[PDB]
Amino acid sequence: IPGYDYGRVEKSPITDLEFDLLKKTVMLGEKDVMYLKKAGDVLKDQVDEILDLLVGHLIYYFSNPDTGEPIKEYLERVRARFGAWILDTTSRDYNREWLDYQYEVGLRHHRSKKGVTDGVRTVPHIPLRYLIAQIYPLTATIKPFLAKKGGSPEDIEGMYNAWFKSVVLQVAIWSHPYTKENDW
C-alpha cells in the first residue's frame, strides 16, 4: 500500500507519559484493547463495505483547489490506507509505534504533509475544526458494522466505545501540529 508507513515513521514529539496520560483521559483500558481486537475480527471482512461509506461535501479536501476537481488517484490511494487504518485501529497495540503513526496521520491532514504522500497538488490543509467534527461520523459510522455479525449488545457497546475512544485519542494526537506552541 503506497504511502502506508505504519511502523516506518519518525519519532513523534509526544512523550510516552503524555501518551499514557492521553489514553487514561479517554479511558482506554485493557478492556478496550480487548474490545478493539474483537472489533478487528468483526470488521476485517467488512472493510470494503465500510470504505464505500467513507472514501472511494468534504470531497473538496481530495480535490485540486483551483479547479475543485477531485483527484481520483488521491482518493484511491488514501482509501487503501484508510482500509488499513480500520484494521490498525482495531488490531495494533497502542504503543509508541502506534502513536508515531497516528502523529504521522495527523501531519498528513495538516498543511505540514497533506498531499505529499501521494504527490498530488491538493487542498493544502484540513482545518482542525473539521478533524474534530469528523470524530462523530467516523465513530458513529462503524457501529452498524460492529453489530451486523450479531452477538451481545454489551459486546457491541464495548467494541463501539473502544473505537470511539481510539478515534478521539487519535484526533487528540493529531491536534498537536495544529495547536499553538504550549497550548496542546
The 3-class SS string of 54-79 reads HCCCHHHHHECCCCCCECHHHHHHHH
68: contact with a second copy by CB under 8 A: no
Q: How far is the CB of 2 from ligand HEM (least distance, A)?
A: 10
Contact partner, 82, from a second copy, ligand HEM, none, Cβ < 5-8 Å per class: ligand HEM
What would the x/- binding string for ligand HEM be over residues 79 to 118, using CB under 6 A?
--xx--x-------------------x--xx----xx-xx
Contact partner, 129, from ligand HEM, a second copy, none, Cβ < 5-8 Å per class: a second copy
Near a second copy by CB under 8 A: residue from 7, 29, 56, 144: 7
**CB 45 within 8 Å of CB 125:** no
d(CA 45, CA 131): 27
Near a second copy by CB under 8 A: residue from 82, 98, 101, 164: 164
Cell numbers that stand for 12 in this block: 513523534
**CB 58 within 8 Å of CB 130:** yes
Cell numbers that stand for 137 in this block: 461520523
10: contact with a second copy by CB under 8 A: yes
Cell numbers that stand for 162 in this block: 473502544
23: contact with ligand HEM by CB under 6 A: no
Q: How far is the CB of 177 from ligand HEM (least distance, A)?
A: 13
d(CA 153, CA 97): 32
